[PDB]
Amino acid sequence: STMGQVGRQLAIIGDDINRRYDSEFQTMLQHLQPTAENAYEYFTKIATSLFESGINWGRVVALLGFGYRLALHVYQHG
């Protein structure tokens, strides 16, 4: 069925995205040193800088992915 085939290709695309960019997200978080106190400020300034050069679905979902990593990073620390 095309549904299962599409799901399986999305899985490989997802894992490709994970592998390609997760270490880059790690490094960005290292440089940012976010805290619970500054996470919202940082996320909105990052988004502002991102969208200053345009918007497409790729940029939106990259921001959401990074924002989830940012929240989780702050959670697991402080």
Ligand X SMILES: CCCCCCCCCCCCO[C@@H]1O[C@H](CO)[C@@H](O[C@H]2O[C@H](CO)[C@@H](O)[C@H](O)[C@H]2O)[C@H](O)[C@H]1O
Residues that bind a second copy (CB under 8 A): 1-11, 13-22, 24, 28, 31-32, 42, 45-54, 56-66, 68-69
Minimum Å distance from CB 41 to ligand X? 6
By C-alpha distance, which of 11, 53, 45, 52 is closest to 28? 45
Interaction between residue 68 and ligand X (CB under 6 A): yes
The one-letter code for the residue type at 11 is: A
| 63 binding partner (options ligand X, a second copy, none; Cβ < 5 to 8 Å by kind) | a second copy
CB 15, CB 54: distance < 8 Å:
no
From CA 68, how far away is CA 76, in angstroms rounded? Answer: 12
Residue 7 structure tokens: 């799901």
Q: Of 9 and 35, which has the nearer Cβ to ligand X?
A: 35
| 40 binding partner (options a second copy, ligand X, none; Cβ < 5 to 8 Å by kind) | ligand X
